[model samples]
Target: ALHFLDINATEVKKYPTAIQDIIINRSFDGMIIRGVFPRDTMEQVARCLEEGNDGGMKSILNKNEEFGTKVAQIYGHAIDYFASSAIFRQACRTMFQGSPDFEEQVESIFHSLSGLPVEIPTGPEGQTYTPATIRLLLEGREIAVHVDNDAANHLKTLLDLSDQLSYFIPLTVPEAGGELVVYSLEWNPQEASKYAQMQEYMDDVEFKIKSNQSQSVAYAPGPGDMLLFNGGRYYHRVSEVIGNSPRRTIGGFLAFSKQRDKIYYWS
Candidate 1:
């Protein structure tokens, strides 16, 4: 129904995961809170992210080759930010045009704390600068997050209930292979070789600590469940993608606030 009908579920399964979701972790000194967005809403955003506007096919011409070349086969262009794009805003308007209450609910929940202008720092490959983020800006920092279905709905509520938006985003069941890992070495253009070890570090942590923590805490989630913690105060990593499907998420970031605050350093 989703694939053929362009409905949220079908399109999300097709477009959001494979096509639009890209952009590596950015550098910020603070906490991170992650959650799943609505399947339909995120699908809308992901579809727009994958769309080939004048910028070209999102995530295709611009993804990191080391991540894999299959990216091109899926996305028509290298993706950039779509947070405030006319097309994206229009789509959001179209989706929730009549539901002012819901729209306000969404805005209050998702963007109220972080607010607009979600910034994404340039990653490796000199191809940095992807404007694909849902962020909340604070006094001197920005909180960026990847919202998937399970985490999405709750995020709005969570934001409304409390103002703290600093924690890790969990991957979907299918994305069991993917993990939220922190690298020990800095991302050096001359030392692209370092990413390899970083990848290895992630692998080990995911299998050993991350996976166990989820089990230990009994932290199980469905589609739009947001996970909040004091990222500014703790150290953590996500479990690897152990489920059937590939890991998919709406990642967040702390826009422009670099190195001024952080609890644990990644290594």
Candidate 2:
């Protein structure tokens, strides 16, 4: 059995006012925000992150145009990883387990596009100066392989114990502060229109999650603590870190089998 540090071990409960506050005050686009898992999981997850395989500034910028469209379509929602958890995980997993499949999958994405072989570019603000990453959705009960490492094993254990899908897993990374963020949506733009004038991402000037000081909050998941929220509706982003340490974490979705009547929303 792996050791777990109890960073957040509270019972699952969301204050009614707290829930209402996020809805009315923040216009937070999604529902249900809560924390799950313990502090140990956060540290372990952070441990899973490392630096490698950035497409470089120019290469990435050139490819950003096509990549953005592809991601939007694949996730069935708008997505901007703003970081490279995928590359980081792939590199570290290969070192830890000697498997190159994950990284290979990422490499193929670049080739799939029509253009000079380049990487996704970074925005001028350089807010996304960290490693490279990719964002895609997993639908239809897809099985993702997690290496047989401590961090991955812990994630597997958590899934076995969870009764809910809204969750956050913080891991130990070389960077000072960063958290793995997930969002869920119960309804789409059409549904949101019932309450407010919602705009689809393809429209002029899109909306996205950011981590800058002006319109963001600093929520870092400490070792062993899992920060969870209703991901299906919530638009979330992982904040960058101030420290210099590699973070590692392994986790995934908890959901029931698909039923046609259920309207699943990711954006």
Candidate 3:
């Protein structure tokens, strides 16, 4: 699962093939394209967040005895955003077509890295889905271990829901930690209900799922780096960020359409 093709191209303007196939064919758990998104572009987003000019950012702090800590400081929602048509449109307008070609940068980056057709798919009632969500994880906060299939299940029709690749590009990274840890343990959809991930996190739980030899690899990338992986099939988490200045990122999930003619993107 630690197997990943790390491509260190300061800037990739042309198509680079064979990455998606590698993940799909189970050759590697994921791949990282270093400095693919220009630091200038990443800096722009970081500045926007700093100036309080982000695209409607929000936060979700979960604390329950049943589960544990889960923080979602991101724009839009997995279900609430799609459930309301009006809200969905505004989010898409503000995020999908924001400014200075954020959407353009993302579409081009994925198209070149993936070597496949990609587009932002429509949400419920013909509205376009938010292309991405900006996440800001404060000091000591982390994205707990969980599979992304839960998001797909809520909007199956819009998503291919066959196999998913969760990707993120960092606008700002903390001085320490905030690495992505992906476990070799593959999630089974058929018996998903039986897995601890079905309703709880594997780590940071009252009754954690203990692994004798838990095999996982941590991916640490700098600003403008893109990390793409099979999040639907693997258990992944973001390590706690040690310092102040939140870890900022723009991310979403991608998968082929029903016809396999295009790869649709959404958060």
Q: Cα miss at 35, model 1 (Å)? A: 9.5
**Against the true structure, what is each candidate's TM-score?**
0.34, 0.33, 0.78
Give model 3 RMSD, 1 decimal: 4.4
Query: Model 1 segments beyond 4 Å from truth?
Result: 1-62, 66-106, 110-220, 253-267
How many clashes (backbone atoms < 3 Å, residues ≥3 apart in a chain or on different chains) does model 2 have?
54
Q: What does candidate 3's lDDT look like per residue over 1-267, in tens digits?
A: 357767765444442654456445666667787876677767776775576554444232123335333564655554456543244334334533444365676777677766678787774457666667667677878887777765445356654637788889888999898888887666655554555673443433223324435577888889988888889877788989888867887788888766656778877
lDDT of each: 0.29, 0.29, 0.66
Writing each residue's lDDT as its tens digit, candidate 2 over 1-267 gives 111122223322223232223222433322212234334433332233223232221122222334332211111111234343333443434433323232232223222211123232234454322222222221211112111111122223212211222333333433443443332312255544554343443121123332221232235555434443334333444434344343433333322112211111111
Taking the candidates one at a time, how many backbone clashes does each contain? 56, 54, 0
Q: Considering TM-score, which of the candidate structures 2 and 3 is the better prediction for this target?
A: 3
- Winner by TM-score between candidate 2 and candidate 1: 1
Of the two candidates 1 and 3, the one with more favorable TM-score, higher being better, is 3
| Cα error of candidate 3 at position 199, Å | 5.6
**Worst 10-residue lDDT window, candidate 3:** 58-67
